[PDB]
Amino acid sequence: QGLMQFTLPVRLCKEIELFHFDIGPFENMWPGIFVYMVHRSCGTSCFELEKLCRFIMSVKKNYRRVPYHNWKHAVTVAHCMYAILQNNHTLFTDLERKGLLIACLCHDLDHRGFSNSYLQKFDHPLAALYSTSTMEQHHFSQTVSILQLEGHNIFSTLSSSEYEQVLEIIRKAIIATDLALYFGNRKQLEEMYQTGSLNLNNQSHRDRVIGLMMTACDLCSVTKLWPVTKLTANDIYAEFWAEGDEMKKLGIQPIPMMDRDKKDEVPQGQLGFYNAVAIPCYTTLTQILPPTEPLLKACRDNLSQWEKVIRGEE
Ligand SMILES: Cc1cccc(Oc2nc(N3CCN(c4ccccn4)CC3)nc3[nH]cnc23)c1
Ligand SMILES: [Mg+2]
Ligand SMILES: [Zn+2]
């Protein structure tokens, strides 16, 4: 380093600070965008440039060429977190700023384009090793593997204590991306917020709140400008419809969300998703972290775009 500040063209320098930023089609700029976010989010001192670059390039190598659960998603989810952390400067610990951008870059490592359900029904070996949150325990496992490669220990300077704390933040953060766990997490956070028992000094409460940030970042396609939201949904459904095909090959009617013959039901399905998952997610997040409100506003804008799709106004 250390006088070696990463800088982005003006349009990117400004728009990267905004929640609805799209990282663009230039794959070779994504590492630099991430380093930029680490430096501003954490410090130019938090990681050794050489180690961080080697870590990033090994993480990229271990995402697959699947339509949605790919390297672009990793960097997209890390950017939403960057926007949360930067809008909530003083709420997060030094270990948290470090751990969470990494947890986001790593959160779908070695994803195969298939749900936990599909793995369980296929009887994949990963389903025997990890009975619940199957892919998420895998993703955390790949994260540790890459951290243990020569020249890849970005945490090398931390004490044995802090190293164990940061790997434990990463683990909880990655596990929280199991959407099956989100519904209960958000219900508890809602009750806590509304009986005024929420306490960010309670580690167990911080864990929940970080879990909600992870869901929020992970679903952030719904918080983009409509053309990004719409074109991202196409990639999401390309994966789901492939899984649906694979379900049919095991002799199992897929759920409609995964059935490409039920394309007509997408718009009504998106309404349910925004109502049951997305809006409640961003609403509770905004309650706990008021500056995240642009995610909720952007989400509601996208619900309204799907309602126009239904009314044939597009
Ligand atoms: C932004 C986004 C885009 C695509 C998929 C997505 O993830 C998901 N979408 C939904 N809903 C969406 C759409 N669904 C239907 C139904 C009939 C046909 C098509 N889609 C029905 C439930 N439910 C989910 N449960 C877990 N994950 C879900 C998110
Ligand atoms: Mg995932
Ligand atoms: Zn994800």
Task: List strands and helices in order, with pairings.
Layout (H helix, E strand, L loop, with lengths): L9 H6 L14 H12 L7 H13 L9 H17 L6 H13 L9 H7 L2 H5 L4 H14 L12 H16 L3 H16 L8 H16 L7 H24 L16 H23 L4 H18 L4
Helix pairs in contact: 2-4, 4-5, 4-11, 5-9, 8-9, 9-11, 10-11, 10-13, 11-13, 13-14
Zinc ion binds next to α4.
Walk me through the structure.
The structure is a monomer. The chain is mainly alpha-helical and 314 residues long. It has one domain: Catalytic domain of cyclic nucleotide phosphodiesterase 4b2b, CATH 1.10.1300.10. 64% of the residues lie in helices and 0% in strands. It contains 14 helices and no strands. α2 runs parallel beside α4. The longest helix is centred in the C-terminal third of the chain and has 24 residues. The chain is globular. The N and C termini lie far apart (51 Å). The structure holds ligand IX9, magnesium ion and zinc ion. Ligand IX9 binds next to α12 and α13.
Biggest sheet layout: none
CATH topology: Catalytic domain of cyclic nucleotide phosphodiesterase 4b2b
> Helical segment tally?
14
Count of discrete structural domains: 1
List each distinct ligand once.
Answer: ligand IX9, magnesium ion, zinc ion
Radius of gyration: 19 Å
Please give the number of β-strands.
0
Oligomer: monomer
Helicity level, as a percent range? 55-70%
Give the amount of beta strand, in percent. under 5%
Q: Which geometry do the CA atoms define?
A: globular
How do the helices and strands follow one another from N- to C-terminus?
HHHHHHHHHHHHHH
Question: CATH superfamily name?
Answer: 3'5'-cyclic nucleotide phosphodiesterase, catalytic domain
Q: What is the terminal-to-terminal distance? A: 51 Å
The secondary-structure class comes to mainly alpha
CATH class reads Mainly Alpha
